[PDB]
């Protein structure tokens, strides 16, 4: 039974799931709009809201935790120079979960992530 276990685990083990989270939110912050599955979409939604509001207060500690979470070096330093100028006054809700057709070969419920 799963009463109140609000972690959203995928079809992958724990450390591989962490690497899926970090890599897919990294390239989500790289391209902005991205094609995922819906489980991967909500799993991106929590963590990428944590990474938008993490470097919202652009200190050194937030920048070092944020650089520790994201893989690529030059994308964290392109983030806190962009998120207070764009996502000020939004106060949560930084994405959008536009769904699409299922994937040929799996009938996988396929989703599509914005930044709005």
């Amino acid at each position: 039974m799963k009463h109140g276990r609000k972690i959203h685990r995928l079809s992958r083990p724990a450390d591989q799931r962490r690497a899926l989270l970090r890599g897919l939110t990294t390239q989500l912050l790289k391209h902005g709009r991205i094609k995922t599955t819906r489980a991967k979409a909500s799993a991106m939604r929590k963590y990428v809201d944590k990474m938008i509001t993490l470097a919202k207060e652009g200190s050194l500690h937030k920048r070092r935790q944020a650089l520790g979470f994201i893989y690529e070096k030059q994308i964290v330093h392109a983030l806190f120079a962009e998120v207070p100028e764009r996502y000020g006054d939004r106060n949560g809700g930084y994405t959008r979960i536009i769904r699409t057709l299922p994937r040929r070969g799996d009938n996988a419920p396929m989703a599509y992530i914005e930044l709005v």
């Binding site: 536009i98 769904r99 699409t100 057709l101 599509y112």
Partner: protein, 46 residues
């Protein structure tokens, strides 16, 4: 585990038609999605 005998044409057409009726139930859903995919402001299907 090993089946004692075989099934009739009776029970097999019942079970296969329950399988294909279970295929029938998942296309009026696809008719609804194909009808909502048409002209209208829907925040999906980029």
């Amino acid at each position: 585990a090993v089946p004692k005998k075989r099934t009739s044409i009776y029970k097999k057409r019942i079970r296969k038609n329950i399988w294909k009726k279970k295929g029938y139930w998942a296309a009026l859903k696809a008719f609804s999605l194909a009808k909502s995919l048409s002209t209208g402001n829907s925040k999906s299907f980029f």
